PDB file of C-alpha atoms in Angstrom:
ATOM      1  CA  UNK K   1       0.000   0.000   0.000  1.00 28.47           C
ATOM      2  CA  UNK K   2       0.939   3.605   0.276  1.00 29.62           C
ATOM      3  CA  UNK K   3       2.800   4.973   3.392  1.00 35.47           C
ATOM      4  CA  UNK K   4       1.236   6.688   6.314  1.00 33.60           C
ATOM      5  CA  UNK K   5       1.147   9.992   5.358  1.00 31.83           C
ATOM      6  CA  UNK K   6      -0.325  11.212   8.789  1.00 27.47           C
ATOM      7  CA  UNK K   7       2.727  10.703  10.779  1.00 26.02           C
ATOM      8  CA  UNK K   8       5.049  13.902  12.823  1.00 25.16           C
ATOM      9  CA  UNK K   9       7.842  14.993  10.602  1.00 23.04           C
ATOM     10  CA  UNK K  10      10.638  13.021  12.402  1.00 21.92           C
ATOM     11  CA  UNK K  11       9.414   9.913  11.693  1.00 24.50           C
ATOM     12  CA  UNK K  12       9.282  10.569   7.680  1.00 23.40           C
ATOM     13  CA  UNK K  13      12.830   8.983   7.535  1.00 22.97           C
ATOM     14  CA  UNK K  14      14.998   8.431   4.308  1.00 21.04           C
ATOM     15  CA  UNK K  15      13.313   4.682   3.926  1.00 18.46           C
ATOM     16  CA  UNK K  16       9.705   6.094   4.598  1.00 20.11           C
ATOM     17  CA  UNK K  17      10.352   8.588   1.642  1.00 21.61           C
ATOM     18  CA  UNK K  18      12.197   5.861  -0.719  1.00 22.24           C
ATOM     19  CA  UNK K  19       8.573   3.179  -0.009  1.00 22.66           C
ATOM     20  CA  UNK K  20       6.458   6.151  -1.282  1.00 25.16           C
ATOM     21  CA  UNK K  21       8.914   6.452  -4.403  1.00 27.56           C
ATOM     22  CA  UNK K  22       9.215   2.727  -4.831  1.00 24.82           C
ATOM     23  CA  UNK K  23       5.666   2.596  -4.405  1.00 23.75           C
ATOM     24  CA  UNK K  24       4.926   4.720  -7.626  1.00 24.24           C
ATOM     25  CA  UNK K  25       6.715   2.047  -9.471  1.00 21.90           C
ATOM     26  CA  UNK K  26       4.238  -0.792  -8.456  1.00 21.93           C
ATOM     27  CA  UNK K  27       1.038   0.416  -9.446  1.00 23.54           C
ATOM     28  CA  UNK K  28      -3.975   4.518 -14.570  1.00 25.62           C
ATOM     29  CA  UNK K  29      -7.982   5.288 -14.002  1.00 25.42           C
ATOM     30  CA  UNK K  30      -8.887   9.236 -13.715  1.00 22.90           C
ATOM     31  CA  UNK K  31     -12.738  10.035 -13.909  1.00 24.45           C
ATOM     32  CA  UNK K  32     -12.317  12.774 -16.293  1.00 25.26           C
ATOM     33  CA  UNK K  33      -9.571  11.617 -18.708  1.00 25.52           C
ATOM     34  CA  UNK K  34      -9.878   9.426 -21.658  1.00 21.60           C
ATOM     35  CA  UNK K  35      -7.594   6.527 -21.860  1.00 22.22           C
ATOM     36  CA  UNK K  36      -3.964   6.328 -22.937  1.00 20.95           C
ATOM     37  CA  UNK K  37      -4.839   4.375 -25.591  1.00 23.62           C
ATOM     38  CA  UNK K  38      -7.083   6.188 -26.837  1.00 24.71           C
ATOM     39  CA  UNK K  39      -5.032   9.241 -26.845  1.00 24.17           C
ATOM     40  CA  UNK K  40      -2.589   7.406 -29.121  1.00 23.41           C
ATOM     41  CA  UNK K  41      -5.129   6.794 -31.412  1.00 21.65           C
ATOM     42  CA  UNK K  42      -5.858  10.073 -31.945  1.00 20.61           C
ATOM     43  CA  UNK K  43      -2.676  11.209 -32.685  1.00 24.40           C
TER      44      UNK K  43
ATOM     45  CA  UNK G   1       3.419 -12.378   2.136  1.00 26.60           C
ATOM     46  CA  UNK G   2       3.051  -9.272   0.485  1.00 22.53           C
ATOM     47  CA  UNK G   3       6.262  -7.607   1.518  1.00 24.29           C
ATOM     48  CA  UNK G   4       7.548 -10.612  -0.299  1.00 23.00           C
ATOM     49  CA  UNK G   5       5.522  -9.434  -3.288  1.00 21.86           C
ATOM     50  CA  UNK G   6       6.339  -5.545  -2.642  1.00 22.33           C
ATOM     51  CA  UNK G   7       9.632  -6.304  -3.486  1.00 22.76           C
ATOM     52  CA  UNK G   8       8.655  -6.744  -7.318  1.00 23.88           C
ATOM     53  CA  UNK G   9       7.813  -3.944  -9.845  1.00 26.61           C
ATOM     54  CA  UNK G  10       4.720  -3.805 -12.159  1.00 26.69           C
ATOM     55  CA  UNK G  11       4.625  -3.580 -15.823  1.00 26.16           C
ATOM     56  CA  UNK G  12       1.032  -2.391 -17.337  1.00 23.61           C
ATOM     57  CA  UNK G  13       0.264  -4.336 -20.194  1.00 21.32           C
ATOM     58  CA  UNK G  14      -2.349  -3.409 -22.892  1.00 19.24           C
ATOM     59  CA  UNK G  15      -4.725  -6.183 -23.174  1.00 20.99           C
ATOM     60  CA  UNK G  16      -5.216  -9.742 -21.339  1.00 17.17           C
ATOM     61  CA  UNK G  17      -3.975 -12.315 -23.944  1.00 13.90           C
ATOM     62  CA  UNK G  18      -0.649 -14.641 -23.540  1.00 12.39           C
ATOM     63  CA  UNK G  19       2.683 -12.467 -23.472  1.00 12.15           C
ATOM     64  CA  UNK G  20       5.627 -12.911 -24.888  1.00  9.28           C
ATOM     65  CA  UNK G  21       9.302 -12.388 -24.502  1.00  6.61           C
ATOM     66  CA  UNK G  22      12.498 -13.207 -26.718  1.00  9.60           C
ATOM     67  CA  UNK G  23      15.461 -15.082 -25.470  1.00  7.10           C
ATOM     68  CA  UNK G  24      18.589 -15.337 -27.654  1.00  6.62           C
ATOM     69  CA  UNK G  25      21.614 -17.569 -27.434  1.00  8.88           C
ATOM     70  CA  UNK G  26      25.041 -16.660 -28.999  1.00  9.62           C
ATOM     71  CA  UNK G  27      26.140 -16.719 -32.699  1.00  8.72           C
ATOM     72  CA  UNK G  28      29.503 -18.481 -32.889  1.00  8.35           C
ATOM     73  CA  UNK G  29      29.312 -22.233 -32.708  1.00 10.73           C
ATOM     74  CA  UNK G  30      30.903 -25.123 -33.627  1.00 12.59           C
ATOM     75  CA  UNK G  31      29.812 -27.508 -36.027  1.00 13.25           C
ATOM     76  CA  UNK G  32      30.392 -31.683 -35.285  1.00 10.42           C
ATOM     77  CA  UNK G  33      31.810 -33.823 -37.932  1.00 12.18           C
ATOM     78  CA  UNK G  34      29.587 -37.310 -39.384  1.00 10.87           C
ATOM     79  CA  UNK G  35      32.393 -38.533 -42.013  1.00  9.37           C
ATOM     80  CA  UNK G  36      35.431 -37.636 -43.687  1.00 10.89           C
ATOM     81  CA  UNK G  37      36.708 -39.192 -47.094  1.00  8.16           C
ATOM     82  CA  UNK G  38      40.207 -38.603 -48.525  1.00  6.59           C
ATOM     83  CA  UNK G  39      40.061 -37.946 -52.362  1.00 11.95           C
ATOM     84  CA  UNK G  40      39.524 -40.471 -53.890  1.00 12.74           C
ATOM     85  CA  UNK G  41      36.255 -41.161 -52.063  1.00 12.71           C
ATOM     86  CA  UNK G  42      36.378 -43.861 -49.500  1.00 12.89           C
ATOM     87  CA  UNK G  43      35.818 -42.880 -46.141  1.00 11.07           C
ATOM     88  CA  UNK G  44      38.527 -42.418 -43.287  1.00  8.93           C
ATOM     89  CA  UNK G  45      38.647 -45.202 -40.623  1.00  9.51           C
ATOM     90  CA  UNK G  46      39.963 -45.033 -37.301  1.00  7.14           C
ATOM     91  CA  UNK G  47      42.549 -47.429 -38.277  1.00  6.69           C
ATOM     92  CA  UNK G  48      43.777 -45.521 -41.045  1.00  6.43           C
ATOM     93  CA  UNK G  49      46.437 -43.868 -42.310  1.00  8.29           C
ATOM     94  CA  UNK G  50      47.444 -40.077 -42.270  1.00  7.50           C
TER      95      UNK G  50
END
């Protein structure tokens, strides 16, 4: 999942900012975008 | 279990058929012998001469 966001600022260590950047890597849907492929389609 | 399986990246693929991916060997090879014949024709034996 996604890292606790909610914490104090001295606990967002180095690794707690590297598992919400590793996290981006391993896993788009937006309500009010077409898809990707569709994009390329049109262009 | 999962931080097992956290420890692997995700590729999005486009549909939800069978995937594929190439593997290669080398080019340079060597190539084995079945028979050798001197000139006139006849094969080589083992208990030949040179």
């Amino acid at each position: 999942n996604f890292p606790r966001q909610m914490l104090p600022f001295s606990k967002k260590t180095k690794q707690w900012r590297k598992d919400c950047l590793l996290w981006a890597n391993q896993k788009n849907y937006s309500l009010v975008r077409k898809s990707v492929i569709h994009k390329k389609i049109n262009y | 279990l999962d931080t097992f399986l956290n420890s692997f990246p995700t590729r999005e693929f486009e549909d939800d058929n069978e995937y594929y991916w190439d593997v290669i060997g080398s080019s340079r090879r060597n190539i084995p012998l079945v028979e050798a014949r001197d000139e006139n024709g006849v094969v080589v034996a083992a208990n030949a001469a040179n």
